[PDB]
Amino acid sequence: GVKAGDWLPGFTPREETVYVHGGVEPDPLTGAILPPIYQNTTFVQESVENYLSKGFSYSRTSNPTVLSLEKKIAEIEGGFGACCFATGMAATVTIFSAFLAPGDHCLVTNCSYGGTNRCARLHFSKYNIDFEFIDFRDPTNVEKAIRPQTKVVFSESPCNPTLYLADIEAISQICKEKKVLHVCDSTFATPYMMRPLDLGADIVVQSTTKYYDGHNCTLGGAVISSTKEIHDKVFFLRNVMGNIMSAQTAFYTLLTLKTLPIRVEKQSANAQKIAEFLSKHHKVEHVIYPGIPSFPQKELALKQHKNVHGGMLAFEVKGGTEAGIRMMNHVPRPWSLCESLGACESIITCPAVFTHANMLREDRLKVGITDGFIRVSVGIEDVNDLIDGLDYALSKA
Amino acid sequence: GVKAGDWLPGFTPREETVYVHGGVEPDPLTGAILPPIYQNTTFVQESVENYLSKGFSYSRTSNPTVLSLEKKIAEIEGGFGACCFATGMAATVTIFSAFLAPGDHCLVTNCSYGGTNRCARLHFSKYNIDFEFIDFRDPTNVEKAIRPQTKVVFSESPCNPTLYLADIEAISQICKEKKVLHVCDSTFATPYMMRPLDLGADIVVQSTTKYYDGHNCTLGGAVISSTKEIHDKVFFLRNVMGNIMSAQTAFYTLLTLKTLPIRVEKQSANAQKIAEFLSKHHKVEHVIYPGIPSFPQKELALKQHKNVHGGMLAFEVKGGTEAGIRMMNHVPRPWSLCESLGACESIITCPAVFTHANMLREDRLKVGITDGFIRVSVGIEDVNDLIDGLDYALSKA
Amino acid sequence: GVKAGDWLPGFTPREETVYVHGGVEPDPLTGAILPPIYQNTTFVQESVENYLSKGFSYSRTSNPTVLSLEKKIAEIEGGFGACCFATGMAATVTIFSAFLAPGDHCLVTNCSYGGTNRCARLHFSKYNIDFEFIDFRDPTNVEKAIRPQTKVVFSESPCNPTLYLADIEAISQICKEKKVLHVCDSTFATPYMMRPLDLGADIVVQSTTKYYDGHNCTLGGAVISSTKEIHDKVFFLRNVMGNIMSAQTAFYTLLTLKTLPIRVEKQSANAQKIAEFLSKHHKVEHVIYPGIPSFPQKELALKQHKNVHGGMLAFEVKGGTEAGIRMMNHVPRPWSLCESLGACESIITCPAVFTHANMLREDRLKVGITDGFIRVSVGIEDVNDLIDGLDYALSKA
Amino acid sequence: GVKAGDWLPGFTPREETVYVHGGVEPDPLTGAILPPIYQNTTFVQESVENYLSKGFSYSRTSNPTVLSLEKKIAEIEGGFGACCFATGMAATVTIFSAFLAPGDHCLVTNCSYGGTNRCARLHFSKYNIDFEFIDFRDPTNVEKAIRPQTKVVFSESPCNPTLYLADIEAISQICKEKKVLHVCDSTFATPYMMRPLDLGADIVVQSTTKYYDGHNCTLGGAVISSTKEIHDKVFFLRNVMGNIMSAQTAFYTLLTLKTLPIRVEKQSANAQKIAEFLSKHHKVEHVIYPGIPSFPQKELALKQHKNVHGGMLAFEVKGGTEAGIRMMNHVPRPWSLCESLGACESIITCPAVFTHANMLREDRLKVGITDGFIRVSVGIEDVNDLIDGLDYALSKA
Ligand SMILES: *Cc1c(COP(=O)(O)O)cnc(C)c1O
Ligand SMILES: *Cc1c(COP(=O)(O)O)cnc(C)c1O
Ligand SMILES: *Cc1c(COP(=O)(O)O)cnc(C)c1O
Ligand SMILES: *Cc1c(COP(=O)(O)O)cnc(C)c1O
């Protein structure tokens, strides 16, 4: 006896259906196909007794539009619950705030996002928290590096900007047996390519700014928790630290998430062809893309990546920094010379003076951010226009 | 001598690149990759002499965000210029307002969009303007129906909701020879499948609400003009009618247009599979989709449609109206029972009681909207969820 | 037995309370103190039978956020119902579209808003509608000018930009006995100063752009109807012409209307002091403000204006157009040299080359838009900064 | 030699002018009177050399709309610079994060905002930071409580919800002599009533949610710094914490700040009248408002408060908790029973079960939140509707 507005009972909706409809039904009051934007601070209570009977009191704590996005994200990432934040850094900082105390040790990937690296080194370390930056490419490095004071292992795959991979399943099995919390930043992957919670991760952190949005429109962060206990701690501390996502940002992201599968398919198809083109180019030294046959962690990429190998690639121009700068300054439209990634608009970044400018050169070269190192975020433009643009820039390099 | 931020001189961006970047450059003041939202009524003038030296005065006349979208839409549709409106109906009535006067004749497709039919019959006819509703499937019907008083031939392809095609190139040749304005409503097609301006149409009307948006988010209309003289007349009357698009709507549509190609490709692939499924179902009498062999105008569809056959399909359920209603009442999620189309969310409607209810039964049967006729807007959900839903709904009909 | 969330029975809330709370209760679903933004095209229906059971189908026809604003505006203006439009011109054009047909005569104030004047002359007159521009300052002029074909009398008070007044009560009594529709554009007045529906007007038209908004934020129009019959005709034709206000604009205006009383009180207090200052200035020829004792229609102003005499004033600089241009070019911040009015930001406009540039000089001088004629919209800045700015500009004139 | 669009050199705009125009000029590109909304994550760079030549790179670090609001807030509060945050709690925790380390001591008012109390006690205390809660009504309590480890003295005036005053000038003198940072939360005051930076405070924290917004529309926080050195530390850590305000929130707050003076004047006039009414009501035990003679700190209120005594008042209903609850349950419209304050909409709350429920009864009585204690946020409705509502509610207590 299923009528209009009901799902078929005992059917799990397929992946793409969840991206379109996840966590959202038509507005009960009006039938509005999209959830209305609760651009609203406070919620009126029926009485003192029925406090929070309608589930809302204050937008810093929870907001109906934000909760809709959180339900969708929790379904897509395969988690118990999600908390949405003003930014990805807010999401990351909340993890470090909640699960680390003075005396605690934290293993972080040495090729973590520059922001995650700095907020560990230049802030949370002042609370006598020891962050140790190690190579996550070999899971035994993680297992051997775990101390009695280790509370959190913070993986990132692919890594910003070197695109190093971490065996999330193998690291998760090590963290389970050692009773350590495994947090994974899968911003570069998206849940369409890799869901760390499916591979035994305790917590996933997303910069929704990048691919979730994918339109260079909004800042956003998400923490997706494997358990209620972890979710409740994140939720409690988000309310205290006042870094929740806004209703308007949640509305934008609810809209953009709908097309993430078709966007990432197109970006990844463009990225494959661009990586192949760059790998044949006589003025390109190295190309890094998980999808080209020369990728050093090809076997882990093939085990861990579903559907695609992503929109992110990196390469090095022959002739060091000078050639890198010449190319960068001569990369024409439709390319954009700027920070960020994961957008419909193709972006070319130089991580040395943009994103990892606060890292010492000796340290930048140690991790793999080399002299002429270019990070590329592939958009959904015609791939021939993108290759034309790179070919011109490389000719001028 | 071309640096970053410049297009290569003498090169034209390819189709998908125009959807991403068309009519938009980074903000000259800040470098903002997206153009800022000019949520702003009035513009300060440097002096009385330098009035409109910066190109803006009042947002009813023109707004920078709206102009950015208009430049993109003009590039995508292949027109001299575009004017953006609050709705597709606003765009349509501005055409009727500008180009028709008492004693003038207007030929309109008899299977026009319901609202277009009504704004003609129930409003503009009171100004002694003669609207004649004819079958556009045979171009010689148009040639033979044109009078000395005929100012506008108003085609729609595919037609709402019967999906009849009009030979835009043949009708354009007739209209040029008789020196009549050929206006084409290509809302159902999108410029990704068919650009009427490329086929000799003088004006294109779009409901940007449908596919341009494709997220059920905003109302909008566009008029794309072949010439400066037509564009200037539409621009002038828009300022008078006060039916310009808002900056916020234009920003939304600037974002959603970027993914129109990948959305329409996905919707069209789903539609092909759904049309094939319905064509073999014993409770389905007829299926209308330009991409299946049973389509009456397959020759014109193959000549006129680029890339895809679109996200719109129709079918007739056996057992007439009662069966149609029983089916509609039992169409489960992820289907939405509502008006509108072209969205990521799959939509199903019975045009007899929703959109074409003001047309008496005798005439709605005469045009092609039969008793059990269903209009289907295919979204980007997993096609197996959409087919399973239609299959269950059909079991109750 | 009144609980929290209920009004006291048999109590009419006072004026300022209606500006804050009019047409809006907490969201039934969540208790959200502000109504959520229905940024949404279409509404899902329960079944074919319960079509429109939740009151919404398509946002071009009606939207929940727009309906909330319409309820507030109808209460504030003292009307049966209100329809909100994309712009004030859209509201005006819809009145002319609905209530005028070929052969019909329409009496308009010769000092009507430039846009209203042009849309009558340069558009609707092509439908063989006769617009006669007469002096509305004497109500007997209106009574004597009424022909057998007169369907609409279109008053404006105060007039843009000359601030001439029309006796709305006297014109209403003439229109009732002659069976003619009385439409009043009270944009310049606001319902806080003058409600034409209270003075027997059949229809009020508002540019909500000006004072309703009062922040230079949004474009908007409102038609407030005295009867259901008139409201239903406006509503029907708004849906056909697709010129409805957007949910986002309605949300902005719901927010800004809350402070209209305190804004207009402050603007009017500043305007009184500025008008007094200008009336004493040795380089100012004439000052027009309904609140200064020299105002030619002082007696009608005192009868017709409640609370205030408005934020709009006008003056003429001695030395003709050259002195007018010198002053205009030397008016410093916090003044803004631009079009529009009614905003928190003080605006100075020259109607000759800004707003009435399409009117012949001989015609501009005939109506009272003289050589050195300045229109002033007074904001809520410190009046001493505004006077300082004018005094400097006048010194340079 | 000053033309239109320029401030007169050597003149400072007066108070109300700064609220309207502060930190904002017409858009240099278009002349847009309001600054456009930079709904935009990343900013394109001209070259590698000219990195940040246009002042922006990534919206987590800085955004043009947010910077415009920060310049306005810095001017209004009389600070070197301001940083804007997602919430007031984000602003508060950024102060604690930046200026406290393990072994450091922090003096906080014992009648602080509930959330501020909890973020100290239940989070930052885990970093071995000693928070001591003392009575700020006597400045010698602060002087005697300061240790060699004291880095921050965190005052709040008026205090939430008891409306106790702190002598900001006296506490500032003590803090300067002991070289301790004086941070003042003046959310309840607004800069229209009290600017702590003028009284020697090193940092001001604002919940812009409350009075800056005043429309129950947006969440927001501001940190206004006395010096560049303090500002740079707050700016740096905001980028790390990822708790910056969104461009859309900043646009809303840029608009609402314009009317703060006229809003607060109206709210304060209503509050005075409500406080006087409650002070004579037989069912009211105590009334707390700085503007009535019974206010314990009337001497400090007259010295410290400019223009008004604010929109916040408190009272104790006779018959303890039961009576308080019966009253709250029967407070009619236009009152709203909810959390938050400072809005156009009058708000009433029992802080025992809403805001200060996590504080055990023994301590909440010790600080001043008595059994029948009611916090009242007075809006801009007609005062007779607000008094009639309180009168009815009191009849049921
Ligand atoms: C961008 C990014 C972040 C930080 O997210 P924001 O939204 O920029 O604060 C964290 N991790 C990775 C991998 C990122 O790319
Ligand atoms: C929807 C539609 C219109 C009208 O557009 P609105 O945005 O709804 O006003 C016109 N033509 C066609 C073919 C449509 O589908
Ligand atoms: C501005 C104005 C209008 C037109 O309204 P818009 O919102 O600008 O379309 C009409 N009448 C008067 C008196 C006006 O001032
Ligand atoms: C509300 C409030 C805060 C916290 O601000 P949010 O915007 O709610 O995070 C801090 N201090 C005071 C005095 C407040 O009233």
Residue D310, CB half-sphere, CA atoms under 13 Å: how many?
31
Tokens of A41: 């601070």
Tokens 């010689």 sit on residue: B140
Distance CA C100, CA C125 (A): 10
Parent domain of C69 = 15-255
Exposed, middle or buried, C229 (CB in 10 Å: 0-12/13-18/19+)?
A: exposed
Q: Which residues lie across from B348 on neighbouring strands?
A: B337, B376
Contact A241 D42 (CB under 8 A): no
Nearest to A265 by CA among A158, A378, A388: A378
Q: What are phi and psi of C67, to 5 degrees?
A: -65, -40
For residue D55, give the DSSP letter.
S
Return left, alpha or beta for C225; rule: phi > 0 is left, psi -120 to 50 is alpha, else beta: beta
Of C31, C36, C37, the CB nearest to A44: C31
Tokens of C226: 């005295």
Q: Which residues contact A173 (CB under 8 A, 6 or more apart)?
A: A200
Does C327 appear as a known binding residue? no
Give the three-class secondary structure for B75.
helix
For chain C, first and last CA: distance in Å?
67
Torsion of CA C78, C82, C86, C90, to 10 degrees: -90
Q: What is the DSSP pairing of strand C203-207 with strand A373-377?
A: unpaired
Query: Residue C223's domain is classified under what CATH number?
Result: 3.40.640.10
Tokens of C189: 């007045």
Contact D39 B42 (CB under 8 A): no
Using alpha carbons only, give the angle D119, D121, D125 rounded to the nearest 5 degrees.
Answer: 95
Sheet holding A312-317, edge to edge: A284-288, A312-317, A373-377, A347-349, A336-337
Of B33, B55, B64, the CB nearest to D44: B33
Distance CA B271, CA B386 (A): 10
Tokens of A34: 């999209």
Using alpha carbons only, give the angle C139, C140, C141 rounded to the nearest 5 degrees.
Answer: 85
Task: Tell how far the Cα of A344 is from the centroid of ligand 2, in angstroms.
Answer: 27
Give the three-class secondary structure for A330.
coil
Q: Which residues contact A211 (CB under 8 A, 6 or more apart)?
A: A187, A190, A260, A263, A264, A311, A342
Distance CA D169, CA B37 (A): 43
A158 close to ligand 1 (CB < 6 Angstrom): no
Distance CA B310, CA B342 (A): 9
Data resolution in angstroms: 2.2
Handedness of CA A25, A28, A33, A39 (dihedral sign): negative
Work out the minimum CA distance from B73 to partner chain D, whole angstroms.
21
Distance CA D40, CA B36 (A): 7
Q: Which residues lie across from C347 on neighbouring strands?
A: C336, C377
Residue A268, CB half-sphere, CA atoms under 13 Å: how many?
20
Tokens 């931020």 sit on residue: B5
Name residues contacting ligand 3 (CB within 6 A): B 60, 242; C 87-89, 113, 115-116, 156, 160, 185, 187-188, 207, 209-210, 219, 221
Distance CA D22, CA D40 (A): 23
Interface of B with D (CB under 8 A): 3-5, 26-34, 36-47, 54-56, 64-65, 251
Using alpha carbons only, give the angle B133, B137, B142 rounded to the nearest 5 degrees.
Answer: 55
In whole angstroms, how far apart are CA B197 and each of B80, B89, B291?
10, 20, 23
Query: Residue C237 is inside which H or E element, if any?
Result: helix C228-241
Distance CA A202, CA B53 (A): 59
For chain A, first and last CA: distance in Å?
67
Distance CA B222, CA A158 (A): 42
Distance CA A156, CA A154 (A): 7
Sheet holding C284-288, edge to edge: C284-288, C312-317, C373-377, C347-349, C336-337
Q: At residue B1, what is the residue type?
A: G
Exposed, middle or buried, C378 (CB in 10 Å: 0-12/13-18/19+)?
A: buried
Distance CA D30, CA B27 (A): 11
Q: What is the DSSP pairing of strand C203-207 with strand C221-225?
A: antiparallel
For residue A219, give the DSSP letter.
-
Q: At residue A37, what is the residue type?
A: I
The angle, 0 to 180 degrees and rounded to 10, between the axes of the packed helices B114-121 and B88-99 is 30
Spatial contact of B371 and B352, defined as CB atoms under 8 Å apart: yes
Does C27 appear as a known binding residue? no
Neighbour count for residue D49 (Cβ, 10 Å): 11
Q: What are phi and psi of D141, to 5 degrees?
A: -55, -45
Distance CA D144, CA D160 (A): 24
In C344-387, beta strands by DSSP E: 347-349, 373-377
After which residues does chain C show a gap where C to N exceeds 2.5 Å? none
Spatial contact of D217 and D251, defined as CB atoms under 8 Å apart: no
Q: Any alpha helices (H) in A100-246, and if so which ranges?
A: 114-121, 139-145, 168-177, 228-241
Using alpha carbons only, give the angle A160, A161, A163 rounded to the nearest 5 degrees.
Answer: 80
Tokens 């900056």 sit on residue: B247
- Best residue in B16, B217, B248, B353 to probe A by mutation, most A CBs within 10 Å? B16
Distance CA D364, CA C59 (A): 50
Give the three-class secondary structure for A326.
helix
Neighbour count for residue D384 (Cβ, 10 Å): 15
Torsion of CA D224, D229, D234, D239, to 10 degrees: 130
Give the three-class secondary structure for D274.
helix
Pocket perturbation via mutation, ligand 2, pick of B203, B210, B252 by most ligand atoms within 8 A of CB: B210
Name residues contacting ligand 4 (CB within 6 A): A 60, 242; D 87-89, 113, 115-116, 156, 160, 185, 187-188, 207, 209-210, 219, 221
Exposure string for B311-325, b = 16+ CB within 10 A, e = fewer: bbbbbbbeeebebbb
Tokens of A98: 């909640």
Sheet holding C181-185, edge to edge: C81-85, C221-225, C203-207, C181-185, C150-156, C105-109, C130-134
Tokens of C33: 């103190």
| Diameter of chain B measured on Cα atoms | 74
For chain D, first and last CA: distance in Å?
68
Contact D392 C8 (CB under 8 A): yes
Distance CA D52, CA C375 (A): 42
Spatial contact of B19 and A345, defined as CB atoms under 8 Å apart: no
Task: Tell how far the Cα of D354 is from the centroid of ligand 4, in angstroms.
Answer: 14
Nearest to B97 by CA among C97, C154, C83: C97
Give the three-class secondary structure for D74.
helix
Residue B363, CB half-sphere, CA atoms under 13 Å: how many?
12
Q: Whose CA is nearest to atom 2 of ligand 1?
A: A207
Method by which the coordinates were obtained: X-ray
Spatial contact of C57 and C44, defined as CB atoms under 8 Å apart: no
A188 close to ligand 1 (CB < 6 Angstrom): yes
Distance CA C274, CA A334 (A): 53
Q: What is the DSSP pairing of strand A130-134 with strand D347-349?
A: unpaired
For residue D278, give the DSSP letter.
H
Q: Which residues lie across from C183 on neighbouring strands?
A: C154, C203
Q: Which residues lie across from B284 on neighbouring strands?
A: B317
Return left, alpha or beta for C211; rule: phi > 0 is left, psi -120 to 50 is alpha, else beta: alpha
Rounded to a whole number of angstroms, the CA Rg of chain A reads 22
Q: What are phi and psi of C350, to 5 degrees?
A: -115, 100
Contact D334 C382 (CB under 8 A): no
Distance CA D243, CA D235 (A): 11
A375 close to ligand 1 (CB < 6 Angstrom): no
Query: Residue A317 is inside which H or E element, if any?
Result: strand A312-317
Q: What are phi and psi of D281, to 5 degrees?
A: -80, 130
Tokens 């309840």 sit on residue: D188
In whole angstroms, how far apart are CA D371 and each of B277, D350, D352, D365, D367?
69, 9, 7, 8, 12
Spatial contact of B220 and B86, defined as CB atoms under 8 Å apart: yes
- Could you please report the per-residue DSSP string of A265-302? HHHHHHHHHHHHHHHH-TTEEEEE-TTSTT-TTHHHHH
